[PDB]
Amino acid sequence: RPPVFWLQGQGCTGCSVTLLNSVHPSIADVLLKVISLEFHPTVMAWEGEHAIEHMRKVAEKFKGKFFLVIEGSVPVEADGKYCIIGEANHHEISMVDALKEFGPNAAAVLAVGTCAAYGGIPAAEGSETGATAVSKFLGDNGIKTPVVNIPGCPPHPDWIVGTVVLALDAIKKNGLEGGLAEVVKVLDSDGRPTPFFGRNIHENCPYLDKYDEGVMSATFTDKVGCRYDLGCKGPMTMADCFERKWNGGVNWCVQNAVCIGCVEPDFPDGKSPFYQA
Amino acid sequence: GRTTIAIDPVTRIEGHLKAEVVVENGKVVDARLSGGMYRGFETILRGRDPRDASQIVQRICGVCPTAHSTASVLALDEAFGAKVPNNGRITRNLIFGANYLQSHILHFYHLSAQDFVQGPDTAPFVPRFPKSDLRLSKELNKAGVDQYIEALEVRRICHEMVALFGGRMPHVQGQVVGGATEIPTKEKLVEYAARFKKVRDFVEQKYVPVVYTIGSKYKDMFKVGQGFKAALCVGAFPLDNSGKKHLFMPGVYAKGKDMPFDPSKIKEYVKYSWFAEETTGLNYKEGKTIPAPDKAGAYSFVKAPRYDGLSLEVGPLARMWVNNPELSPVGKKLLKDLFGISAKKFRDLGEEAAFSLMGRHVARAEETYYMLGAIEGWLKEIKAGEDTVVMPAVPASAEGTGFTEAPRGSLLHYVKVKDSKIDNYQIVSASLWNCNPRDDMGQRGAVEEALIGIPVDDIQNPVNVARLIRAFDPXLGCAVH
Ligand code: SF4
Ligand code: SF4
Ligand code: FCO
Ligand SMILES: [Cl-]
Ligand SMILES: [Fe+2]
Ligand code: NI
């Protein structure tokens, strides 16, 4: 049962919260039987340098075998000072330093959320922290550990759990190394698993007929027309929200309002203004 | 004689926090809180279409995004001159109210309960301090574990409630300038009410009773954590369309006195914060956010907000104290049976016990019950099919301020619009009021002060430092933004 360490950089904890909303039949087993969530600052029992040292002892015992979940971007300006994640016997550990320490020794890294995947809101125009995507940061620092991106702001819990399931099945079938190689084959050019991000929202939208007819809603509460004029970014967005919907299937963004393209590498600036085409 | 203890990360909170305390003769005698992660939303927002704010700001915090959504759309409503339709006002209350339920349940069970309840021998419930001061009987400890598990379901259902009219959660799509984007249907109102009944039953039968019952085994924890005994509420959940009656009415309480809230008395100091010295002491309408991560003497990315010079706290205790509602039936009964206390209204707990480590947990449970009544009312008030939004034009020049109460306390957003774009956007949030560093005059932040006197009889197992902090339910994403 491999350990998982969940490190957050410049995130909003939305990736943890979205996972707490999972109704995936496998999630309890993932946490109780398949892996061991040894470090997670939002929910773990211990604290402080003790929690950091616990993670370090586990990481040493499972060198090459543990998994990192990284949420949030990694800020490089000011020598990493815009994100400190812990302190060990007076020595501060920035997100930069944490990834330089643990990154080389992980079996793989899951970059969860658009911030970790692509930079996201912390990297957007007007920011000043040098917010950097996980894969870019690791590459820039010569760390070749495999990274899978599971974006969204936040991701749907099914994308996170589903990617874990994909990986589990691949690793059972071909071993750690070979398994990861099979996972690579089903990633798109932005490092996203194609089962969840391989279809365009707009091509699969229930309002596509209205789009084609040129019937556009002029107020959000008109649910008959297409939402394009209200700012819907479905045409430029690769995600399966149209099918699984959100929060136990009770709604989704296009039904409720508009898609804002939250899974895309240019989010938010390339998807803004949100409420104009 | 003095021992300094540093805790980084403080866990079972949201976000990045370091606490440093000095312990002497078994008690905390000094404290410093450091918010260690910064993003800079107030500068990221500049130059954008102001309507984008009501999406961007939610990413300050995935635990309380509906609060930021609310504050933002209220600011935008003012700046745009938008009159939210009655049914949209109520819809917004239903979207946001449901996350109060989610957030308080998450906080007590998934963040706080391990402070008092021993988890099983599996990660992430072990390892932990060898002497964790976990006092509950076999039976009551098991009830805590069982309810933590059940609460995973309940908090998830609360987010389903949020998403019914909000689109999804975290990060609702359904609140915009001018109201709410989806008119409630009869069928979806039935769905919301079915879930709400499950949540109500859990709150009434499990959550409220367990907080009092666990509290009755930790009566010592009502005797510490008082801090300044000063509180702020800025109002929340409008109950009419004329901006006066609210579920929580505004007010300030300090030195035993109640006074009105005047937002012009807010100033944010930065001497001990990693921001440029010249930006100290600004009211939010003139706020500036210029990071200075190397500035000597500073120790946090949280600014230091003060109300007419006072360091105040916010959250359920603040609101319940300021508004002084009647206590829940189950609370009244357990106060009698377990504590020997006859109490009718919240202030009957007395100031000392209310403003305490355990008092804050009690206030949050009581407030969860209080919110059930409000949501029940809104489910009767809402009208299926009635329009919930107007579609205002973007003004070229305007300003607006949105005031509300996030689950952790007072929140305001201020926007200034120039050339149809955001010229300034300033946020003064709940955990900013609680978890801030010293101001320029050396006055501690609310939680820093509440740490003073906290018992640490065992420096190898200093569990009460973070227990105190967790009582305030911090989220440092909010505090720093
Ligand atoms: S623009 Fe949006 S609402 Fe219209 S068809 Fe495309 S995805 Fe659907
Ligand atoms: S519909 Fe669009 S904005 Fe909503 S979750 Fe899916 S990709 Fe993100
Ligand atoms: N609740 C919440 Fe978030 C914080 N602190 C805000 O405002
Ligand atoms: Cl909220
Ligand atoms: Fe601010
Ligand atoms: Ni928050």
mmCIF file with all atom_site columns, N, CA and C and ligand atoms in Angstrom, chain B residues 61 63-64 67-68 103 405-411 428-432 473-476 478-479, ligand 3:
data_model
loop_
_atom_site.group_PDB
_atom_site.id
_atom_site.type_symbol
_atom_site.label_atom_id
_atom_site.label_alt_id
_atom_site.label_comp_id
_atom_site.label_asym_id
_atom_site.label_entity_id
_atom_site.label_seq_id
_atom_site.pdbx_PDB_ins_code
_atom_site.Cartn_x
_atom_site.Cartn_y
_atom_site.Cartn_z
_atom_site.occupancy
_atom_site.B_iso_or_equiv
_atom_site.pdbx_formal_charge
_atom_site.auth_seq_id
_atom_site.auth_comp_id
_atom_site.auth_asym_id
_atom_site.auth_atom_id
_atom_site.pdbx_PDB_model_num
ATOM   1  N  N   . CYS B 1 61  ? -10.723 30.761 -1.904 1.00 0.00 ? 61  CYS B N   1
ATOM   2  C  CA  . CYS B 1 61  ? -10.947 29.783 -0.842 1.00 0.00 ? 61  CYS B CA  1
ATOM   3  C  C   . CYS B 1 61  ? -12.021 28.788 -1.283 1.00 0.00 ? 61  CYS B C   1
ATOM   4  N  N   . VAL B 1 63  ? -13.250 26.403 0.411  1.00 0.00 ? 63  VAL B N   1
ATOM   5  C  CA  . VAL B 1 63  ? -14.120 26.028 1.527  1.00 0.00 ? 63  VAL B CA  1
ATOM   6  C  C   . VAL B 1 63  ? -15.282 27.024 1.675  1.00 0.00 ? 63  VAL B C   1
ATOM   7  N  N   . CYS B 1 64  ? -14.991 28.319 1.517  1.00 0.00 ? 64  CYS B N   1
ATOM   8  C  CA  . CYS B 1 64  ? -16.021 29.338 1.617  1.00 0.00 ? 64  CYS B CA  1
ATOM   9  C  C   . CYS B 1 64  ? -16.242 30.142 0.336  1.00 0.00 ? 64  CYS B C   1
ATOM   10 N  N   . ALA B 1 67  ? -19.227 32.614 0.066  1.00 0.00 ? 67  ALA B N   1
ATOM   11 C  CA  . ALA B 1 67  ? -19.145 33.879 0.786  1.00 0.00 ? 67  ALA B CA  1
ATOM   12 C  C   . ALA B 1 67  ? -18.550 34.984 -0.101 1.00 0.00 ? 67  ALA B C   1
ATOM   13 N  N   . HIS B 1 68  ? -17.448 34.664 -0.772 1.00 0.00 ? 68  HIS B N   1
ATOM   14 C  CA  . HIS B 1 68  ? -16.805 35.607 -1.679 1.00 0.00 ? 68  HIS B CA  1
ATOM   15 C  C   . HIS B 1 68  ? -17.692 35.909 -2.860 1.00 0.00 ? 68  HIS B C   1
ATOM   16 N  N   . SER B 1 103 ? -20.063 23.923 5.857  1.00 0.00 ? 103 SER B N   1
ATOM   17 C  CA  . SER B 1 103 ? -18.805 24.421 6.400  1.00 0.00 ? 103 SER B CA  1
ATOM   18 C  C   . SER B 1 103 ? -18.673 24.146 7.906  1.00 0.00 ? 103 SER B C   1
ATOM   19 N  N   . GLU B 1 405 ? -21.519 37.895 5.914  1.00 0.00 ? 405 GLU B N   1
ATOM   20 C  CA  . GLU B 1 405 ? -20.873 37.098 6.925  1.00 0.00 ? 405 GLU B CA  1
ATOM   21 C  C   . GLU B 1 405 ? -20.580 35.748 6.303  1.00 0.00 ? 405 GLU B C   1
ATOM   22 N  N   . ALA B 1 406 ? -19.301 35.455 6.082  1.00 0.00 ? 406 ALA B N   1
ATOM   23 C  CA  . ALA B 1 406 ? -18.879 34.132 5.696  1.00 0.00 ? 406 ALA B CA  1
ATOM   24 C  C   . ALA B 1 406 ? -19.043 33.204 6.918  1.00 0.00 ? 406 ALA B C   1
ATOM   25 N  N   . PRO B 1 407 ? -19.032 31.886 6.699  1.00 0.00 ? 407 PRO B N   1
ATOM   26 C  CA  . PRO B 1 407 ? -19.143 30.996 7.867  1.00 0.00 ? 407 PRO B CA  1
ATOM   27 C  C   . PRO B 1 407 ? -18.129 31.281 9.007  1.00 0.00 ? 407 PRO B C   1
ATOM   28 N  N   . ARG B 1 408 ? -16.969 31.818 8.676  1.00 0.00 ? 408 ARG B N   1
ATOM   29 C  CA  . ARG B 1 408 ? -15.967 32.130 9.697  1.00 0.00 ? 408 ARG B CA  1
ATOM   30 C  C   . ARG B 1 408 ? -15.981 33.565 10.203 1.00 0.00 ? 408 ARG B C   1
ATOM   31 N  N   . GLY B 1 409 ? -16.800 34.426 9.593  1.00 0.00 ? 409 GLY B N   1
ATOM   32 C  CA  . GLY B 1 409 ? -16.961 35.790 10.052 1.00 0.00 ? 409 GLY B CA  1
ATOM   33 C  C   . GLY B 1 409 ? -17.094 36.837 8.975  1.00 0.00 ? 409 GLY B C   1
ATOM   34 N  N   . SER B 1 410 ? -16.922 38.084 9.378  1.00 0.00 ? 410 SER B N   1
ATOM   35 C  CA  . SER B 1 410 ? -17.248 39.210 8.518  1.00 0.00 ? 410 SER B CA  1
ATOM   36 C  C   . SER B 1 410 ? -16.400 39.283 7.259  1.00 0.00 ? 410 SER B C   1
ATOM   37 N  N   . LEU B 1 411 ? -17.070 39.575 6.148  1.00 0.00 ? 411 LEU B N   1
ATOM   38 C  CA  . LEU B 1 411 ? -16.436 39.679 4.851  1.00 0.00 ? 411 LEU B CA  1
ATOM   39 C  C   . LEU B 1 411 ? -16.964 40.906 4.126  1.00 0.00 ? 411 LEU B C   1
ATOM   40 N  N   . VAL B 1 428 ? -11.553 42.280 2.660  1.00 0.00 ? 428 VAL B N   1
ATOM   41 C  CA  . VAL B 1 428 ? -11.304 42.252 4.100  1.00 0.00 ? 428 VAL B CA  1
ATOM   42 C  C   . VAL B 1 428 ? -12.159 41.089 4.599  1.00 0.00 ? 428 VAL B C   1
ATOM   43 N  N   . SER B 1 429 ? -11.512 39.962 4.856  1.00 0.00 ? 429 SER B N   1
ATOM   44 C  CA  . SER B 1 429 ? -12.199 38.695 5.068  1.00 0.00 ? 429 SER B CA  1
ATOM   45 C  C   . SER B 1 429 ? -12.184 38.223 6.540  1.00 0.00 ? 429 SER B C   1
ATOM   46 N  N   . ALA B 1 430 ? -12.857 37.110 6.812  1.00 0.00 ? 430 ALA B N   1
ATOM   47 C  CA  . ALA B 1 430 ? -13.091 36.697 8.196  1.00 0.00 ? 430 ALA B CA  1
ATOM   48 C  C   . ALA B 1 430 ? -11.801 36.263 8.879  1.00 0.00 ? 430 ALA B C   1
ATOM   49 N  N   . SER B 1 431 ? -11.062 35.351 8.256  1.00 0.00 ? 431 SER B N   1
ATOM   50 C  CA  . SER B 1 431 ? -9.846  34.851 8.919  1.00 0.00 ? 431 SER B CA  1
ATOM   51 C  C   . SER B 1 431 ? -8.739  35.915 8.921  1.00 0.00 ? 431 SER B C   1
ATOM   52 N  N   . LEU B 1 432 ? -8.887  36.943 8.100  1.00 0.00 ? 432 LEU B N   1
ATOM   53 C  CA  . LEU B 1 432 ? -8.075  38.144 8.252  1.00 0.00 ? 432 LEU B CA  1
ATOM   54 C  C   . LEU B 1 432 ? -8.347  38.818 9.606  1.00 0.00 ? 432 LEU B C   1
ATOM   55 N  N   . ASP B 1 473 ? -11.698 28.151 13.501 1.00 0.00 ? 473 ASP B N   1
ATOM   56 C  CA  . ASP B 1 473 ? -11.929 27.637 12.133 1.00 0.00 ? 473 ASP B CA  1
ATOM   57 C  C   . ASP B 1 473 ? -11.197 28.463 11.054 1.00 0.00 ? 473 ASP B C   1
ATOM   58 N  N   . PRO B 1 474 ? -9.868  28.601 11.178 1.00 0.00 ? 474 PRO B N   1
ATOM   59 C  CA  . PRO B 1 474 ? -9.150  29.410 10.199 1.00 0.00 ? 474 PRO B CA  1
ATOM   60 C  C   . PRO B 1 474 ? -9.114  28.844 8.803  1.00 0.00 ? 474 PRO B C   1
ATOM   61 N  N   . UNK B 1 475 ? -9.068  29.776 7.877  1.00 0.00 ? 475 UNK B N   1
ATOM   62 C  CA  . UNK B 1 475 ? -8.726  29.464 6.477  1.00 0.00 ? 475 UNK B CA  1
ATOM   63 C  C   . UNK B 1 475 ? -7.833  30.565 6.000  1.00 0.00 ? 475 UNK B C   1
ATOM   64 N  N   . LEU B 1 476 ? -6.565  30.224 5.831  1.00 0.00 ? 476 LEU B N   1
ATOM   65 C  CA  . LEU B 1 476 ? -5.585  31.238 5.509  1.00 0.00 ? 476 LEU B CA  1
ATOM   66 C  C   . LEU B 1 476 ? -5.644  31.672 4.051  1.00 0.00 ? 476 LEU B C   1
ATOM   67 N  N   . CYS B 1 478 ? -8.437  32.569 2.647  1.00 0.00 ? 478 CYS B N   1
ATOM   68 C  CA  . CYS B 1 478 ? -9.199  33.794 2.879  1.00 0.00 ? 478 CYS B CA  1
ATOM   69 C  C   . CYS B 1 478 ? -8.391  34.892 3.509  1.00 0.00 ? 478 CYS B C   1
ATOM   70 N  N   . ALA B 1 479 ? -7.601  34.584 4.533  1.00 0.00 ? 479 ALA B N   1
ATOM   71 C  CA  . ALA B 1 479 ? -6.940  35.643 5.321  1.00 0.00 ? 479 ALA B CA  1
ATOM   72 C  C   . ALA B 1 479 ? -5.976  36.452 4.474  1.00 0.00 ? 479 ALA B C   1
HETATM 73 N  N1  . FCO C 2 .   ? -15.774 31.404 5.928  1.00 0.00 ? 3   FCO C N1  1
HETATM 74 C  C1  . FCO C 2 .   ? -14.955 31.881 5.259  1.00 0.00 ? 3   FCO C C1  1
HETATM 75 FE FE1 . FCO C 2 .   ? -13.656 32.637 4.198  1.00 0.00 ? 3   FCO C FE1 1
HETATM 76 C  C2  . FCO C 2 .   ? -12.668 32.991 5.717  1.00 0.00 ? 3   FCO C C2  1
HETATM 77 N  N2  . FCO C 2 .   ? -12.074 33.188 6.708  1.00 0.00 ? 3   FCO C N2  1
HETATM 78 C  C3  . FCO C 2 .   ? -14.242 34.313 4.179  1.00 0.00 ? 3   FCO C C3  1
HETATM 79 O  O1  . FCO C 2 .   ? -14.595 35.404 4.225  1.00 0.00 ? 3   FCO C O1  1
#
